[PDB]
């Protein structure tokens, strides 16, 4: 029923549960390092297989409290040379595999907190199988999610002005990954080497909502203070005020399309499909 | 004589590329001087013995 993901003392059980005929587990096997010749005077190429293969695990599940969700995010984001162990509840797998968060990806863990659902979180994990004895590194960096026991609106503070995000149709997605870790080929064995790096991680919060009332004032406050100002080295304070048990993080909107205002025919309100924030330097 | 008080903390770098450069290095120089009529050998014994 539950897959256990653990690192020493820290343990999270993810219920491998989903509706109907949805994919709970995908295990992809590969040989990224086979050299197949592009040319030569044969009909069929000569090949050489000399290196570790690839095994990628994709886990889809559901978590029944926010506390465990934050623990999972912290577990995935942490830089530590203590092996990360995955226990899969299926007989086609060994009892424990040693894993890295997806080898080069910004999105190893996705957590979705959708509208209408209470105490039910969507989990998507991507993990890469690494050699248990080849987890190498120097630094420990303990990831923490700031938590508080409030109830207040999601607040966005930039340049002395606070915007309160509409509760109406409000969804949150959190993406976590470790793209700066190196998973590397080794000769003569099945599984690659994991170089744990005490370096920059990916941590992104995405919001979706409908703006229903005081529409100009709400949207203009966000766009004027966040988008039309230069923020400098500092950024935006994103405060959950205890929603989902979350607190305050420093963030910035990144890229070409982090915010969209959508107007549909015959509607008296504005849709925000996406508002994206990446967590910036804070952690002493 | 001058120190940059700010420094580069572990959070303040974001790329690095640090070599030891040694492809040009030699251990003996002979200099002809005085219209080429006299010579002096400069002798780096350490590198010669280490090689």
């Amino acid at each position: 029923v539950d897959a256990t993901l653990s690192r020493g003392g820290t343990s999270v059980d993810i219920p491998l549960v989903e509706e109907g005929g949805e994919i709970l587990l995908s295990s992809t096997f590969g040989k990224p390092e086979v050299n197949v010749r592009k040319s030569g005077g044969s009909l069929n190429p000569r090949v050489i297989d000399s290196w570790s293969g690839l095994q990628t695990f994709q886990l889809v599940g559901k978590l029944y409290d926010y506390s465990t969700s934050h623990q999972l995010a912290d577990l995935v984001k942490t830089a530590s040379t203590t092996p990360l162990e995955l226990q899969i509840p299926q007989d086609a797998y060994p009892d424990t595999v040693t894993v890295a968060p997806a080898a080069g990806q910004a999105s190893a863990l996705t957590l979705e907190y959708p509208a209408g659902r209470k105490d039910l979180v969507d989990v998507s994990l991507s993990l890469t199988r690494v050699d248990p004895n080849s987890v190498r590194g120097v630094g420990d960096q303990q990831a923490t999610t700031p938590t508080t026991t409030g109830t207040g609106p999601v607040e966005v503070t930039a340049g002395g002005t606070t915007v309160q995000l509409p509760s109406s149709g409000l969804s949150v997605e959190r993406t976590v990954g470790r793209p700066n870790d190196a998973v590397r080929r080794v000769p003569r064995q099945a599984d690659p080497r994991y170089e744990v790096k005490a370096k920059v991680t990916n941590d992104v919060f995405t919001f979706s909502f409908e703006t229903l009332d005081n529409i100009p004032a709400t949207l203009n406050a966000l766009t004027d203070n966040v988008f039309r100002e230069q923020l400098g080295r500092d950024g935006v304070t994103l405060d959950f005020n205890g929603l989902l048990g979350l607190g305050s993080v420093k963030a910035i909107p990144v890229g070409s399309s982090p915010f969209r205002q959508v107007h549909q025919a015959g509607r008296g309100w504005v849709t925000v499909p996406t508002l994206e924030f990446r967590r910036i330097y804070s952690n002493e | 004589t001058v120190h940059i008080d700010r420094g580069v903390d572990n959070t303040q770098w974001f790329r690095y590329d640090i070599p030891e450069l040694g492809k040009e290095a030699i251990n003996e120089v002979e200099v002809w001087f005085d219209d080429g009529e006299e010579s002096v050998i400069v002798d780096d014994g350490t590198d010669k013995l280490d090689l």
Partner: peptide, 23 residues
């Protein structure tokens, strides 16, 4: 996005591009 020895060779031309006409 292209790198030689981890350093970017893409020119930081400050030119904008924005979503094409939808059709």
């Amino acid at each position: 996005n292209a790198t030689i020895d981890g350093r970017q060779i893409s020119e930081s031309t400050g030119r904008y591009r924005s979503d094409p006409s939808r059709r």
